[PDB]
């Protein structure tokens, strides 16, 4: 049930939730997929993560216009890497309010990214401070601790079986944890398990670079990270 729209792919995961997928050719290595989410919440649409580029992210907004036909109220991006924040200009051009971890926004210029318009901050237990995430509807944002990057955050979709681990979680068939260039290998395992504990009701785990998996993806990722300590 994958729908193609331009160079992007869209898959419905639940009555009010879709996965968006965009690709970037990396020289010598080929096209890399990156996933994010689109959530219908009453009379508005919420987006998790941009596509790799501005042009691709504009196509997400175009797809939303056609298939859902409701205004995009806000977007949350899960850390300061190109696959998650590469298309920020397309959102700001459309007047969509954007949110990121304060640390992601602090890092964005160093990473060549455009910072989100707004900053999220987090309690010592990892849950977002409600004052920084107003009107997020079903999006429950959790900072699990450093892992894939120092700033990585995760999102559960309230009222569904779905939680989004971003680039922190790999699927149960994954060989490696991928890019460890920016990673915290000491705390990764604990951060992956913290994401699992934060969303115990989630049975469908969506991640950046694999099709949705079961909760086994969290545990398998944690046990791979265990060996990096
Ligand atoms: C380019 C960056 O956005 C990078 C990142 O988020 O750090 C992307 C691409 C690699 S894909 C490598 C996975 N390899 C699997 N065989 C990756 C990942 O492994 O999570 N994320
Ligand atoms: Zn990343
Ligand atoms: Zn990634």
Author numbering: 42 to 270
Authors' account:
NDM-1 belongs to the B1 subclass of MBLs that requires a dinuclear metal center for full catalytic activity. Zn1 is ligated to three histidine residues, H120, H122, and H189, while Zn2 is coordinated with D124, C208, and H250. To address whether carbapenems undergo pyrroline tautomerization during hydrolysis and whether diverse protonation mechanisms exist for different β-lactams, we conduct a combined investigation on NDM-1-catalyzed hydrolysis of imipenem and meropenem using X-ray crystallography and NMR spectrometry. Our data presented here revealed informative details of the reaction including (i) double-bond tautomerization in the pyrroline ring following the cleavage of the lactam amide bond; (ii) three derivatives presumably representing EI1, EI2, and EP; (iii) absence of the bridging water molecule attributed to steric hindrance from the newly formed carboxylate that is forced to take a distinctive orientation resulting from the trans configuration of the β-lactam ring in carbapenems; and (iv) exclusive stereoselective protonation of the carbanionic intermediates.
Although both tautomers showed convergent conformations, our structures revealed two divergent modes of imipenem-zinc binding. In four imipenem- and all five meropenem-bound structures determined in this study, the carbapenem intermediates present in either Δ2 (EI1) or Δ1 (EI2) bind the dinuclear metal center in a consensus manner with hydrolyzed penicillins or cephalosporins revealed in NDM-1 strucutures. However, in the remaining two structures containing Δ1 imipenem, one oxygen atom of the C6-carboxylate (C7O) intercalates between the two Zn(II) ions, giving rise to hexahedral coordination of Zn2 with a significantly decreased C7O–Zn2 distance, from 3.2 to 2.5 Å (averaged for all imipenem copies). The imipenem molecules in these two structures show an evident shift forward to Zn2 by ~0.5 Å with respect to their counterparts in EI2, albeit remaining an almost identical overall conformation. As a result of this translational shift, the C3-carboxylate moves farther away from Zn2, markedly increasing the C3O–Zn2 distance to 3.3 Å, essentially beyond a canonical ligand-metal interacting range. Although N4 still maintains tight contact with Zn2 in this binding mode, the enzyme-intermediate interaction must be weakened due to the detachment of the C3-carboxylate from Zn2. In comparison with other imipenem-bound structures, the antibiotic molecules modeled in these two structures have significantly lower overall occupancy than the imipenem counterparts in other structures (0.74 vs. 0.89) and display higher flexibility in the R2 side chain. Considering the weakened imipenem–metal interaction and lower refined occupancy, we suppose that the species revealed in these two structures more likely represent an EP derivative in which a protonated product has been generated and is ready to be released from the active site.
